[model samples]
Target: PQITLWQRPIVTIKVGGQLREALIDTGADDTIFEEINLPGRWKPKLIGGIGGFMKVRQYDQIPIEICGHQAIGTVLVGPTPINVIGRNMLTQIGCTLNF
Candidate 1:
């Protein structure tokens, strides 16, 4: 699909067996979620960016599935306006930028 940053590039995402819509954000370094329903332990952290600093749960080794592509690693759950598929996980899905 031809995607530009102007486009939302919304995709179907699976986390904790629940399907949700998320934006494919190559500019972001970490994948962020509005919330995570997965039962697990996490370390708390303060993240600052976009909308200023906010508390986030740093969940380790969370499996993320996007359009049948999957990546297992740290996933940050926080108060975000929209769900983001950041570079950390994007690279695993073979997402690369081109002119």
Candidate 2:
């Protein structure tokens, strides 16, 4: 099946009972949730981006609903401009891109 990418791939997602709008960031390797409370045991992990490095909580097996589809994987919680749904969860939703 062929998958399409939106120039601004934005989608609505639910994380731990909190509903927020997020970008489906094809350019990111990890999913980032902004200023949201995370449940379960998480550790301090540093993630680098165009802006520089920041410490974020690396959460494993976090359940998320993207556009009503159930997906589960690692979700990083930190301070970010916005919440992002990266490749980790995108692949589960069958997203694809080619050069």
Candidate 3:
């Protein structure tokens, strides 16, 4: 299946006070964070992904500053080929992506 790109909103999450920008992607089935250069305290947990079950983790909810708006949500730790903001946080914000 060919996936399409949809823009919702973006939030910048920080680990150890280092901010990383991500695009809010509704097509993503799960929340994925960049594994490289991530904080050590962000514990990894065993969870399921779209490809089946995999190890996932939860990170501390830091204040996300986005488009001059601020939001707080716990980030899920994972390795991504690239930085992507997934449905985990978007669903809570009541946003639907339209291609």
Candidate 4:
């Protein structure tokens, strides 16, 4: 299905039996999720955003269903203002932004 660019590109995503809303932000390079519990081990990482840099946890090889399409990728967990599906997962999910 084709979507128009009039509104925010937000979508429902499924992860480990949990459903959450995410924003498809083309401006971000890495996917960031708000405080959520994920299985397995993760490493500490530092990421920068609109305001400044902050520490986050990097979870790798996580499988997520984006709008019903399954994609495996890395996810960052931290105090993000909102859940953001960045370019990393966007390309994997085949999201194209055009005018």
* Model 2 alpha-carbon drift over 4 Å, by segment: 1-7
Task: Candidate 4: give the clashing pairs.
Answer: none
**RMSD over all Cα atoms, model 1:** 1.4
Candidate 1 C-alpha lDDT tens digits along 9-79: 99999988888899999778888899668767989998788658989888888888987898987888888
Give the runs in model 1 whose Cα sits over 4 Å from its true position: 1-6
TM-score pick, better of 2 and 4: 4
Name the TM-score of candidate 4. 0.92
- Tell me the TM-score of model 2: 0.88
- Model 2: lDDT of residue 12: 84
Lowest lDDT 10-residue stretch of candidate 3: 1-10
Which one is best on lDDT?
2
Question: TM-scores across all candidates?
Answer: 0.90, 0.88, 0.54, 0.92
Candidate 2 per-residue C-alpha lDDT over 5-79 given as tens digits, one digit per residue, 9 for 90 to 100: 645667788998898999878889999989788788998999999979989999999999998888999999999
User: How displaced is residue 77 in candidate 2, in Å?
Assistant: 0.5
Write the residue-wise lDDT of candidate 3 on 1-99 in tens digits. 132455535556554456777777767755566663444466767656467765667665644443334556656666655566666656665566454
Best by TM-score: 4
